Design a protein around this ligand. Structure first.
Ligand SMILES: *[C@@H]1O[C@H](CO)[C@@H](O)[C@H](O)[C@H]1NC(C)=O
Lengths: 31, 48
C-alpha cells in the first residue's frame, strides 16, 4: 500500500533545498 | 523564531546551523541598542 518510501539517504550535508511548487504532451528538457 | 526557542543548546554539544536563502536583517538586532559587548576589534560597524 506504501510506495513513497526512501532508501538509505544518510544526508550528511544536504544544505541546499529548493522545495517548491512544480498522446501526452511531449516533455522536452534541457539540462 | 530561532532566537526565541524554548530549549537552549548545551556546552559540550554545540548546535551548528547553516543558513541559505535568507537576508541579514541587522536592524532587528540593532534596534534594541543592547550591544554592550562591542569588542569588535579588526572590523567596523559602518562597512556592513
Ligand atoms: C555538511 O555539514 C555537516 C555538518 O555537520 C558536516 O558534518 C558534513 O561533513 C558536511 N558535508 C559536506 C561538506 O558535504
Amino acid at each position: 500500500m506504501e510506495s513513497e518510501f526512501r532508501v538509505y539517504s544518510s544526508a550528511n550535508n544536504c544544505t541546499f533545498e529548493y522545495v517548491s511548487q512544480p498522446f501526452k504532451n511531449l516533455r522536452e528538457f534541457v539540462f | 523564531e530561532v532566537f526565541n526557542a524554548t530549549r537552549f543548546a548545551s556546552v559540550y554539544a554545540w548546535n551548528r546551523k547553516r543558513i541559505s536563502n535568507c537576508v541579514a536583517d541587522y536592524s532587528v538586532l540593532y534596534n534594541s541598542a543592547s550591544f554592550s559587548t562591542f569588542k569588535c576589534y579588526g572590523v567596523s560597524p559602518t562597512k556592513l
